[PDB]
Enzyme design. Structure first.
Site, PDB file in Angstrom:
ATOM      1  N   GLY A  17       0.822  -1.216   0.000  1.00 50.76           N
ATOM      2  CA  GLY A  17       0.000   0.000   0.000  1.00 50.76           C
ATOM      3  C   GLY A  17       0.845   1.249   0.000  1.00 50.76           C
ATOM      4  CB  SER A  18       0.301   4.610  -0.109  1.00 50.11           C
ATOM      5  OG  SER A  18       0.199   4.249  -1.479  1.00 50.11           O
ATOM      6  N   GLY A  19       2.417   4.843   2.256  1.00 43.87           N
ATOM      7  CA  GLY A  19       2.760   5.375   3.583  1.00 43.87           C
ATOM      8  C   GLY A  19       2.902   6.879   3.551  1.00 43.87           C
ATOM      9  CB  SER A  20       4.462   9.339   5.822  1.00 40.81           C
ATOM     10  OG  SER A  20       5.812   9.037   5.516  1.00 40.81           O
ATOM     11  N   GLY A  44       5.444   7.574   0.533  1.00 39.37           N
ATOM     12  CA  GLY A  44       5.855   6.536  -0.424  1.00 39.37           C
ATOM     13  C   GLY A  44       4.962   5.321  -0.483  1.00 39.37           C
ATOM     14  CB  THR A  45       4.643   2.598  -2.783  1.00 42.41           C
ATOM     15  OG1 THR A  45       3.988   3.611  -3.543  1.00 42.41           O
ATOM     16  CG2 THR A  45       3.961   1.267  -2.989  1.00 42.41           C
ATOM     17  CB  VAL A  46       3.956   0.177   2.496  1.00 43.17           C
ATOM     18  CG1 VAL A  46       4.395  -0.905   3.468  1.00 43.17           C
ATOM     19  CG2 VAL A  46       3.932   1.535   3.175  1.00 43.17           C
ATOM     20  CE  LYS A  83       7.579   5.848   4.905  1.00 42.32           C
ATOM     21  NZ  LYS A  83       6.975   6.734   5.931  1.00 42.32           N
ATOM     22  CG  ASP A 131      -1.298  10.857   9.660  1.00 41.26           C
ATOM     23  OD1 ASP A 131      -2.376  11.508   9.616  1.00 41.26           O
ATOM     24  OD2 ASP A 131      -1.018   9.919   8.855  1.00 41.26           O
TER      25      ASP A 131
HETATM   26  O1  LIG Z   1      -1.903   0.685   6.023  1.00 41.72           O
HETATM   27  C1  LIG Z   1      -1.392   0.346   4.748  1.00 41.72           C
HETATM   28  C2  LIG Z   1      -0.679  -0.984   4.807  1.00 41.72           C
HETATM   29  N1  LIG Z   1       0.604  -0.882   5.497  1.00 41.72           N
HETATM   30  C3  LIG Z   1       1.441   0.161   5.555  1.00 41.72           C
HETATM   31  C4  LIG Z   1       2.515  -0.218   6.323  1.00 41.72           C
HETATM   32  C5  LIG Z   1       3.658   0.672   6.614  1.00 41.72           C
HETATM   33  C6  LIG Z   1       3.437   2.026   6.827  1.00 41.72           C
HETATM   34  C7  LIG Z   1       4.481   2.896   7.091  1.00 41.72           C
HETATM   35  C8  LIG Z   1       5.772   2.385   7.128  1.00 41.72           C
HETATM   36  C9  LIG Z   1       6.009   1.030   6.908  1.00 41.72           C
HETATM   37  C10 LIG Z   1       4.953   0.169   6.644  1.00 41.72           C
HETATM   38  C11 LIG Z   1       7.477   0.725   6.998  1.00 41.72           C
HETATM   39  C12 LIG Z   1       8.141   2.113   6.998  1.00 41.72           C
HETATM   40  C13 LIG Z   1       7.044   3.064   7.381  1.00 41.72           C
HETATM   41  N2  LIG Z   1       7.203   4.244   7.852  1.00 41.72           N
HETATM   42  O2  LIG Z   1       7.414   4.215   9.246  1.00 41.72           O
HETATM   43  C14 LIG Z   1       2.254  -1.535   6.704  1.00 41.72           C
HETATM   44  C15 LIG Z   1       3.045  -2.462   7.530  1.00 41.72           C
HETATM   45  C16 LIG Z   1       3.767  -2.030   8.637  1.00 41.72           C
HETATM   46  C17 LIG Z   1       4.482  -2.946   9.377  1.00 41.72           C
HETATM   47  N3  LIG Z   1       4.526  -4.249   9.108  1.00 41.72           N
HETATM   48  C18 LIG Z   1       3.825  -4.660   8.054  1.00 41.72           C
HETATM   49  C19 LIG Z   1       3.082  -3.823   7.251  1.00 41.72           C
HETATM   50  N4  LIG Z   1       1.087  -1.939   6.202  1.00 41.72           N
END
Ligand SMILES: OCCn1cc(-c2ccc3c(c2)CC/C3=N\O)c(-c2ccncc2)n1
Ligand SMILES: OCCn1cc(-c2ccc3c(c2)CC/C3=N\O)c(-c2ccncc2)n1
Ligand SMILES: [Cl-]
Ligand SMILES: [Cl-]
EC number: 2.7.11.1
Lengths: 261, 262
Positions: free
Chosen positions: A16-19, A21-23, A35, A128
Site C-alpha cells: 500500500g502507501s505510507g507517509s 511513499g509506497t509500502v 517504504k 498522524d
Molecule cells: O496501512 C497500509 C498498509 N501498510 C502500511 C505499512 C507501513 C506504513 C508505514 C511504514 C512502513 C509500513 C514501513 C516504513 C514506514 N514508515 O514508518 C504496513 C506495515 C507495517 C508494518 N509491518 C507490516 C506492514 N502496512
C-alpha cells in the site's frame, strides 16, 4: 549507521502507501516492511522528509513502536522496518470486522498509550495517529508507524483535533493533538466503527468538527465498555486542547481500568 | 542518544542472573527487563564490559535480537531491554519440559538463525549463545540476548562451547563458526528436548573431552520425526573442525527449505 547498502533489500509485493511513499513487503535479514519513494530524482523536499522521518525513527526503541531497522538511498529512498503479520487496526475494525473481546480492546488501547507515552517523553509528536497507522503483530502486540508527518519540538480527517482541523493556529499540533487522535482511536475500538457514520459529506464533517458543532457520539460504546473508559475517551476527545490529558495520565488510567474487569 | 536520565527506571523483582550482572523486571515506558551490575564501586573491568555491551547493543535493531531500549549510569550501571513474557528456551526445554511441535521447533530454529544472521552481518559475534539467552516473547518470537560476552570482529556455559573455544589454544578462539557450534547445540536441544552429555555428571571431564575431541553430542537421540535435513544441518553446525561448519546464510536457507517441505 543504519544505511543498508544498495542491493541487500529484496522488494517483494506492493502492500500500500505510507507517509511519503509506497509500502512493500520485503526481505532484509528476514521479512521487513519497505517504504519506498518511487521517483527517480528525489525532490529536495522529498529527500528532506526521508531524513526527518529517519532521524525521528533512529530515536525510537520500544515494543509498541514499529522497529525501524534501517534505510536505503539507492536505487531509491527506502525505510525498512520489521514486518507485522496481521493488519492495521483500521483494517481489523473497519474492513474485516474482527470482533475483539473487550479485555483485548483495552489491551490494544493500553499498548497504544504505552507507545505514545514513549513518543511524548521523547518530544516526538506523531501528528498522524490513526487506526491505519496502528499495526497489531501476531494479533497480539501493538506497534505504531508512519512517522513522516511526525516531528520533534493528511487526509486523516477523523483523528484531527478541532484546533488542527481549524488550522487557524501556529503548529496546531501538540501532545494533545495526538491525544485527541488517540481518543478517536479509542472511539473506533469501543464502537467498532468510524466517527460520524451518519454524515456522508467530508467537507461538512471537517467544518463542524472544526467549529465544535460536531463530536463523536460516545453513546455508541459497547455495553461492556468500562464507564471509566467512556470517561477517559471524553477527556481525550475534549474540543479544547488544554482540557485533554497527557499520555502518562492516560496510561495510568487504562492500567487501573485493567486491574478490574 | 540512549542515556536514560537518573530516576526514570523503576527496578522491580529480581528475575535472575545475567552475564555481568543481575536481571530484574522493571518499568520504563512499560514493562522492561533491566540488567544491573549490583556493585557499589564499579571497577574499570566492569565499566569496560558495560561500555562494550552498550556499544554492541546500540547497533542491533532486529525482531529476533532482544530490543535494546537504553542504558543508565546512576543509580547503577544498567542495560534496559523490552520485557519478554514467557521464558528462556532453556526453561521450556529442560525445566518445564514444554512440548513444542516440530513445526514450532523448526520455526524457533529459523528465528534464532534469523537473529544470528543479523548479528554476524554487522560483524557481531555473540560468544555466549545458549538456550538460556534465547527468550520466547509470547511463546512466538525468538529474541536473542545477553550480549555481555559479545564482541564486534576487529564463561561457564560449557555445553554450547565449540572445541576450539574450550581449548583456548588458537588465536581469536571465537568466530562466526564458534556461534554456529553454539547454534548447533541449541538445535540439539530443540531436536532432543534434551541437554548434551546428559549422562555425564562431571563438568571438568566434559570440558576436557570435548576439548580433545573424545566427546561429542550423541545425534542418534534426535526425535524420530526430526527431518533428515535438520539432523544433517545439526551435524554440519557441530563439526569439530571450525571451518567445516556452515555460516548462517547457508543455515537459514536450509531451514527455510525444510519449512517449505513441512
Ligand atoms: O496501512 C497500509 C498498509 N501498510 C502500511 C505499512 C507501513 C506504513 C508505514 C511504514 C512502513 C509500513 C514501513 C516504513 C514506514 N514508515 O514508518 C504496513 C506495515 C507495517 C508494518 N509491518 C507490516 C506492514 N502496512
Ligand atoms: O537467564 C536468566 C533469566 N533472564 C535473564 C534475562 C536477561 C538477560 C540479559 C539481559 C537482560 C535480561 C536485559 C539486559 C541484558 N543484557 O543484554 C531475562 C529476560 C530477558 C528479556 N525479557 C525478560 C527476561 N531473563
Ligand atoms: Cl539506534
Ligand atoms: Cl571459532
Amino acid at each position: 549507521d543504519w544505511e543498508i547498502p544498495d542491493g541487500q533489500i529484496t522488494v517483494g509485493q506492493r502492500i500500500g502507501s505510507g507517509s511519503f511513499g509506497t509500502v512493500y513487503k520485503g526481505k532484509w535479514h528476514g521479512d521487513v516492511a519497505v517504504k519506498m519513494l518511487n521517483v527517480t530524482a528525489p525532490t529536495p523536499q522529498q529527500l528532506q522528509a526521508f531524513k526527518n522521518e529517519v532521524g525521528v525513527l533512529r530515536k525510537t526503541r520500544h515494543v509498541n513502536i514499529l522497529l525501524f531497522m534501517g534505510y536505503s538511498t539507492k536505487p531509491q529512498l527506502a525505510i525498512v522496518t520489521q514486518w507485522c503479520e496481521g493488519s492495521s487496526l483500521y483494517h481489523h475494525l473497519h474492513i474485516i470486522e474482527t470482533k475483539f473481546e473487550m479485555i483485548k480492546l483495552i489491551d490494544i488501547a493500553r499498548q497504544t498509550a504505552q507507545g505514545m507515552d514513549y513518543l511524548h517523553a521523547k518530544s516526538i509528536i506523531h501528528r498522524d495517529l490513526k487506526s491505519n497507522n496502528i499495526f497489531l503483530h501476531e494479533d497480539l502486540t501493538v506497534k505504531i508507524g508512519d512517522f513522516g508527518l511526525a516531528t520533534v519540538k493528511s487526509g486523516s480527517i477523523l483523528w484531527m483535533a478541532p484546533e488542527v482541523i481549524r488550522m487557524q493556529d501556529k503548529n496546531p499540533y501538540s501532545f494533545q493533538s495526538d491525544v485527541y487522535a488517540f481518543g478517536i482511536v479509542l472511539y473506533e475500538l469501543m464502537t467498532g466503527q468510524l466517527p460520524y457514520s451518519n454524515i456522508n459529506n467530508r467537507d461538512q464533517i471537517i467544518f463542524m468538527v472544526g467549529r465544535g458543532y460536531l463530536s463523536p457520539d460516545l453513546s455508541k460504546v459497547r455495553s461492556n465498555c468500562p464507564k471509566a473508559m467512556k470517561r477517559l475517551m471524553a477527556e481525550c476527545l475534549k474540543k479544547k486542547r488544554d482540557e485533554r490529558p497527557l499520555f502518562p495520565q492516560i496510561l495510568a488510567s487504562i492500567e487501573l481500568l485493567a486491574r478490574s474487569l
